[PDB]
Design a protein around this ligand. Structure first.
Ligand code: PX2
Ligand code: PLM
Ligand code: PLM
Ligand code: PLM
Ligand code: ZN
Ligand code: ZN
Lengths: 295, 124
């Protein structure tokens, strides 16, 4: 048997379908999200699209299926994919880095913890300070951070969203944003058309008999109402962080949105170029090969 | 081959958050290889990685063409960044086998070290 590079790859991730996947360990809520989406869409496609196709235009279920396939493809690409994990430092390179660090630190006062290892760079006429990571034994590249759950430095870290079952970094943030947007669209769609179905069928049979026919309608109404009340606010929050070119991890810190309001050096001073660079720009491949062959 | 010491060409974030390597000349590399070919190699790698992360028309067109297929086309087609990392790897290995191995030095591909540094290994 061959020894792939994922069974030895440190961290708290899980690898299924032979290694071509990468998810967190606490993927409990991922199954719940999958079951909710699939169950609500199947209830729709089996109890309301049939009627709204026989007795209305036949484009309703086809467009709903297009939105649902888009949402499913983007959710699976957000969860399964590699969020841009940085490989840990090899022993010699880490030793060399720490040697430079101690040589530059000089004599430390006794009884006092040494000052935090901080490197300062000049990005776009701005002072940017990296921070040492005592686990990965590297200097966090700009915009990177450390997910305390997964325990691996994600590049352009955003947050560890469990509802998708995986971190959200650089390689899978466009897919996460598009999944959120398409799920908000699909929720508004299913909700509006379930209301249309109830109105159009109660005008013919009545309310009590319509309800006694299928309770799937009120089930979907409740599910879509709450899913909207959450996901719409979420997508409104993200459409303003994919435009100013910021990350949730930075907004939480209140760095650029606070007392200073100094320019974030990673931006472009626009909204169109920012949206294009974050959504439709080019992305690096997986920097840690998992299907690689170890000796 | 035995090792005598390792130097690393740290990344450069001066122009932006895009892959670009510093052009400083190492002190240990002195008397082992003339600075001209080293500067050239670093400049060629910089230009290649610039062609990788270059925004504009081609990148946005390819992005929209992929979004038109729910990002299911990346299961069969190799993206642009990989289509230039292949050239980067080929150029690095050919430049190594040409000029670096005779002097007793080794140039590694930055896609191994996580696109962070260049591990130049000095032999004796
Ligand atoms: C309602 C259902 C709609 C289905 C639409 C079809 C596509 C759905 C998503 C398929 C999975 C997918 O795209 O995952 C991509 C990532 C890539 O990971 P990495 O290579 O970027 O590290 O992970 C993988 O490469 C996944 C590997 C396993 C899946 C292989 C592709 C399966 C496609 C569908 C086959 C029926
Ligand atoms: C590895 O750990 C895999 C476990 C995580 C969930 C596995 C199932 C993913 C969803 C696949 C089914 C969606 C396709 C729907 C077909 C219409
Ligand atoms: C690890 O568990 C990898 C799982 C990948 C799951 C992909 C989901 C299957 C999609 C089916 C494609 C369409 C056929 C179904 C009827 C339209
Ligand atoms: C860059 O390559 C892509 C730019 C972002 C695309 C925005 C997508 C808007 C909503 C997508 C949902 C489409 C559902 C299909 C029916 C309307
Ligand atoms: Zn780390
Ligand atoms: Zn994590």
């Amino acid at each position: 048997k061959v020894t792939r590079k994922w069974e030895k790859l440190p961290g708290r991730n899980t690898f299924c379908c032979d290694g071509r996947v990468m998810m967190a360990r606490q993927k409990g809520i991922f199954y719940l999200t999958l079951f909710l989406i699939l169950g609500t869409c199947t209830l729709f496609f089996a109890f309301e699209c049939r009627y709204l196709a026989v007795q209305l235009s036949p484009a309703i279920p086809v467009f709903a299926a297009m939105l649902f396939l888009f949402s499913m493809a983007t959710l699976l690409r957000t969860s399964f994919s590699d969020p841009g994990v940085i490989p840990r430092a090899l022993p010699d390179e880490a030793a060399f880095i720490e040697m430079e660090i101690e040589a530059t630190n000089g004599a430390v006062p006794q009884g006092q913890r040494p000052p935090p290892r901080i490197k300062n760079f000049q990005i776009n006429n701005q002072i940017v300070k990296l921070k040492y990571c005592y686990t990965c034994k590297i200097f966090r590249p700009p915009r990177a951070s450390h997910c305390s759950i997964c325990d691996n430095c994600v590049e352009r870290f955003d947050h560890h969203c469990p509802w998708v079952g995986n971190c959200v970094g650089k390689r899978n943030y466009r897919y996460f944003y598009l999944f959120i947007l398409s799920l908000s669209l699909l929720t508004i769609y299913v909700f509006a058309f379930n209301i249309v179905y109830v109105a159009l069928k109660s005008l013919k049979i009545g309310f009590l008999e319509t309800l006694k026919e299928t309770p799937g309608t009120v089930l979907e109404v409740l599910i879509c109402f709450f899913t909207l009340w959450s996901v719409v606010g979420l997508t409104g929050f993200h459409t303003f962080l994919v435009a100013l070119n910021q990350t949730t991890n930075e907004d939480i810190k209140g760095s650029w949105t606070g007392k200073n309001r100094v320019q974030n050096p990673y931006s472009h001073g626009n909204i169109v170029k920012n949206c294009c660079e974050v959504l439709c720009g080019p992305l690096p491949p997986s920097v840690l090969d998992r299907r690689g062959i170890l000796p | 081959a035995p090792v005598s010491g390792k130097v690393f060409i740290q990344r450069d974030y001066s122009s932006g958050t895009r892959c670009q390597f510093q052009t400083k000349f190492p002190a240990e590399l002195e008397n082992r290889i003339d600075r001209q070919q080293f500067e050239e190699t670093v400049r060629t790698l910089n230009n290649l990685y610039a062609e990788a992360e270059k925004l504009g028309g081609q990148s946005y067109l390819e992005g929209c063409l992929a979004c038109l297929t729910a990002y299911t086309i990346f299961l069969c087609m190799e993206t642009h960044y990989e289509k230039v990392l292949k050239k980067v790897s080929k150029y690095i290995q050919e430049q190594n086998e040409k000029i670096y191995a005779p002097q007793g030095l080794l140039l590694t591909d930055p896609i191994e070290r996580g696109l962070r540094v260049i591990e130049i290994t000095i032999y004796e």
